[PDB]
Structure formats: structure tokens, C-alpha cells
Amino acid sequence: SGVTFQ
Amino acid sequence: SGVTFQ
Amino acid sequence: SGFRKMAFPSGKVEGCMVQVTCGTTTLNGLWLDDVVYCPRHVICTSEDMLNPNYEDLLIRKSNHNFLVQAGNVQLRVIGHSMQNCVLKLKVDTANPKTPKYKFVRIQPGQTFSVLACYNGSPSGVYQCAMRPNFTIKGSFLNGSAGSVGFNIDYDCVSFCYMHHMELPTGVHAGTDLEGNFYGPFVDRQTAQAAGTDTTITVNVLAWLYAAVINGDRWFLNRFTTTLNDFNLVAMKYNYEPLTQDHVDILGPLSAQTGIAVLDMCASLKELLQNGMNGRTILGSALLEDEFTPFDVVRQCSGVTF
Amino acid sequence: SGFRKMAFPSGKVEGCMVQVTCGTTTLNGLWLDDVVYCPRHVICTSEDMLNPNYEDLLIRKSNHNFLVQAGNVQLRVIGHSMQNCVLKLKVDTANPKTPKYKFVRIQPGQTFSVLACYNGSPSGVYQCAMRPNFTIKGSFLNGSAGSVGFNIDYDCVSFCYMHHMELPTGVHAGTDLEGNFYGPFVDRQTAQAAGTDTTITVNVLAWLYAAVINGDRWFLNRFTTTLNDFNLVAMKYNYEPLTQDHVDILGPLSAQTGIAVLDMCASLKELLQNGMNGRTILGSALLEDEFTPFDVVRQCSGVTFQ
User: Fold this and answer.
1) I need a labelling partner for C128 at 20 to 30 A (CA). Which of C64, C136, D145, D227 fits?
2) Hey, what's the signal peptide range on this chain (chains A, B)?
3) Rounded to whole angstroms, how far apart are CA atoms C199 and D238?
4) Which uninterrupted H or E stretch holds D297?
């Protein structure tokens, strides 16, 4: 599912 | 049993 | 006595962390010699991240579009290029705190220390393992990308990880310092998931040796096993196969404690089939797998850097 | 997301570590401005370990009996004095790497980072807590004395612990940086033993809040509890009493998660009764007690994963 770019 | 300095 | 989850001293790395800003996005970079390394997604807007074309995005950027801050000094960017998933920003000053270092790519099951940073400022350090599924179970918030992982050997810092992103299960994905992803992940906003993980068998064995060194012996037993018989049990319990190389690596600990590796394997086999029966090992009710054989030797013998 | 035993970056302390040798005994010292702090038992001999008279041992020493090495550089000692159980060696150079710092004496339950050192050089960094019985569960070998524990909130190093010795159970005892021991311990190798240790209840509750912040609620229940009834139950599992001060300290985490403190106390009562039934909380199969409420706010997002 959705990745988070930190 | 005694303490051991380090 | 005692056994703790121990990180390398981080001072040599702290002197290399900088803040990199491009447009509205701020993250961290690694300043070594006259180059600053950072994740290439610093050039992306949120809309860009849905299907970024990084070559195209970078064309539009000039050197002054990258704001690089080392403490309260702005570094002058004099070149920019991309290597795989990292940007290389050439600056006009070599970092005078550059340690002896190399870039290394690690294998699953190897451990390293993470220096978590925000806004170019080191905030915390902890010890991580590269999981068999190539994720890391980090602790990271927004703005932590560009934080690095490393090991030390004597006076040489081996950089092995740069942080990029978080997966929906809350584990983490990143690259080596040449920008190559660990694991089947891409720096794109799209559905991605970690695969099923397994337990790092050789590290569990190492930690059982650490436990013996520290006086925890209740799991020792009269039995031994073979590599083939043990690996049938490992497969059943989602443990990595044990190889002959792994056996060789444990030999020091094996002789230091007088417990052969396949003797200890018979302990681990029994723990997998029966559990711990209310007991603990080195203060844990789980079988710990983020200490390597060398981590155990290093801590228990007081190796310094 | 994630939750780790996270230490402070150690560089500011690395720059202060030196080696101190007196006779045949070597341990670590802490070099701040023009003073090196170290455990006074560096002046003992193999015949001074059960009942040393440190005043008498020290009056027999000159400044040049102390060999202080900072990396490959010998520092010149120009004065010496004793303050409780630490020696203060005045040197003729201020450490150019001295950070902003203070000395703080901590209370049981507080956490700190330890930079374990040998021969003035760092081996590793880890997180510790001051246990309710005034010991710490460290990882320390011979030669580690003089290693320090610290926090670095904001840009200031707060030094709270200096390592001295190991007790028979394998846990550790030391002093604040004024040289006063934590707990009833003395720097003699005579038999000493720590009191029964207990679990740091307020920290367990903080860590349950961390678990909720990071998205897990499975261990909650529909009940509440009075503070009195919670303590009557928790003490039967060797948990420390929870005070109203502790309740107040948990207020910010309670507000961020919408879980009243006494409702979290009811969840902890059920966890002690039930165990985790094969589950884990933040990667552990035991209830963790070496994260404080301040540590959880330091590490966790300010936005709960609802």
C-alpha cells in the first residue's frame, strides 16, 4: 500500500 | 560475594 | 557483565551531517570530502512523487536551488549530479571533519548503527539489522530521510545505509551510499509492501552464546544435531537456513564457551519446538536476532574505536 | 513510525574522554574545561580494596603521580583534590572540545545514555535506566570505570552518572558527577548487595502510550480503576507504586491518545493478569520499563495513528 517519503 | 571495582 | 543493544560511537558521523533543502522539502545529507550525498527525492513535490521522472526534474534545477547548511554555515553548491537514487552535490569546501571512511553494501542479517537526524542535526543513535526481507525496523519520522547507517572498524567508518522512506507496516527502506536500494522498493509514491520476513538464525545463535557468557544456561541440553536436521526445523519456523559459513563464523564463541555450534543448534531447536516455558534469556522473552557473532565478541571483549 | 532504544549521539562526550593512570591502575576520566573527573579508586592498590582510607592514599600522591592521556597527548596535572568519591585533577589545558554541559543528580526511573569506554576510548553507546534499587543494568568490563551516563536535551550535555563498580549479581553502581553514590553503596570491595528491584510502573505506562501512538490498541479494555486499587494490584507483581505525580506526568500522552491515565492503568492490570497470549507490543514479549514519558514524546510522532 502507500509509501511515505521522509 | 564482594563488589568488583572496574 | 551485562549485555545491551549497543551502537557504535557516533561522533565521527555527527560531524558529517548537513541539512539539504530543495524548494519546500528539507532532509539530511552526508558531507564527505567536497560532496554532499542525499536522497534524490529531495527534488520532488508531492505531485512529482506519484510518477517522478528524476532525470527531468533535475534538469530544471541549478546549483543555487540546493540550500545546504552545515551548522549555521551555508555551503556553496558548485555542481550536482545523480548516482542511482542519491544526489551528489559538489560544494566548494571539503569537510574538515571527514573521517577515514568507505562505502559498503551489506547483506541481510548484518547489523549497523543508525544516526537519526532532523534538519541536519543528529537526534539519536540506535542499532538496527538489515532484515532478510531487506527492510529495517527503524524509528524514523518525517524529515529523517538522509539519515545514515554505519559500522566502524578501528578508525574507518563504513557507511552502509541512507534512509529514504517508510512502508505501510511502519518499517523502513533505503539505499546504500551509491544509491542502490536494499530490497524490491522504488522511490515512488505507489503501493509497496514488505514481503514476509524470517528470523536471522546465525544471530540468534550468537545471542545464545552471549547469554551463556553472561551466565544464562538453562536452555543447554545433552543433545546435538546436524545441519540438515536443524534446517528442516528452521524452515518450519520461518528461520533462515544455517550454512557451513555460519558455523565457521561462530567458532570463536563456540570455543570461548566450550559449546559446539551444533550443540547450541540443538538448544535452539528445542526452544523453537517448546518455547521458553515462562523463562527469559538475557532479559528477553523472545529469541533476539539483531546481534551478529562479531557484535557479541566486540561487546564482551571491550573493543574500542 | 517504529520505536527503538534510542541513545543520544555520543560525539560531545567522546571529545571529553581521557585515560587516567595511577600506579598500575588505569581507568577513564572526563575532561571538562581544565578539570579531569575520575573515580577515586584509581589510587587504590591490591591491598586497598576492602577498607581504603582515601584521604591517606591521596596525601601520599603528587601531581606527577597521575598520568592523564588525551589521545596521544599527555596532559600535565597541576593540582588535585577529592570530592566525595571522585577525584578532580586540575590540568594546565582546557579541553577545546568541552561542550555546553551541566551536572544533574537523577531520580530512580530516569533514563540516560552510557558511553562505555576503555583506556580513554569509546567502545559503544547504549540506553540505561536508574533502577528503583539505585543500580543500573549496564554492560561494563574491567577498565570501564569513569565511563559516564548523560542526556543531551536541547544543546546541553547533562552528565548524571559516572561508573565505578559491579555488584555480585552483575549489575552496576556509580555516582553523580559530584561523587555521591546512587543508592547505599560505597567504593569498597566489601560485600554489598542491592535491594530487591521493582518494575518502573510509570515508564511501562508511557510505553503502552507509545504503542497506541504507533497504532496498536489490542491490549486496551472497557474498564477503569482507582489509583489505590491499581497500586494494590500492581505491587503484587513487584511494580513500583504509581503516584499522583506520575499520573500528572502522563497527562500529555493521555491527551494525545484520548486514553485517560487510569484507563491505561486498567489495561496494564489486565496485561499483568493475562500476559500477551502470543502477541507482542512494540517488538517485545515483555512489558518494557526503560522508556520514560519524556522519552516517548522525544521519539514518537505528535500525531497518533488512529
Assistant:
1) D145
2) none
3) 33
4) helix D293-299
Question: Is C40 touching A (CB cutoff 8 A)?
Answer: no
User: What was the experiment behind these coordinates?
Assistant: X-ray
Residue D39 DSSP code: E
C-alpha cell at C91: 560544494
- Is D210 within 8 Å of D3 (Cβ atoms)? yes
Interface test with D, best of C72, C139, C289 (most D CBs within 10 A): C139
Cα–Cα distances in Å, from C24 out to C137, D102, D245? 28, 37, 42
Q: Do C9 and D10 touch (CB under 8 A)?
A: yes
Residue D157 C-alpha from the chain's centroid: 14
Q: Name residue, grid cell 559446539.
A: C260
Strands (DSSP E) contained in chain D are 17-22, 25-32, 35-39, 66-70, 73-75, 77-83, 86-91, 101-103, 111-118, 121-129, 148-151, 157-166, 172-175
Are the C-beta atoms of residues D239 and D289 closer than 8 Å to each other? no
Q: Which of D194, D203, D198, D201 is nearest to D172 (CA)?
A: D194
Q: Rounded to an integer, what is the distance from CA C187 to the centroid of its chain? A: 18
**3-state helix vs strand vs coil in chain A, percent to 5:** 0, 50, 50
Is D295 within 8 Å of D206 (Cβ atoms)?
A: yes
Interface contact D189-B1, CB threshold 8 A: no
Sign of CA dihedral D99, D105, D108, D114: positive
- Overall resolution, Å: 1.6
Contact of C297 with chain D, judged by CB distance below 8 Å, is answered with: no
CB burial readout D188-210, b (16+ within 10 A) else e: bbeebebeebbbbbbbbbbbbbb
| Residues in chain B closer than 8 A to D142 (CB atoms) | 4, 6
Please, are residues D121 and D143 in contact by the beta-carbon 8 Å criterion? no
DSSP D160: E
Instruction: Tell how strand D17-22 and strand D25-32 pair up.
Output: antiparallel
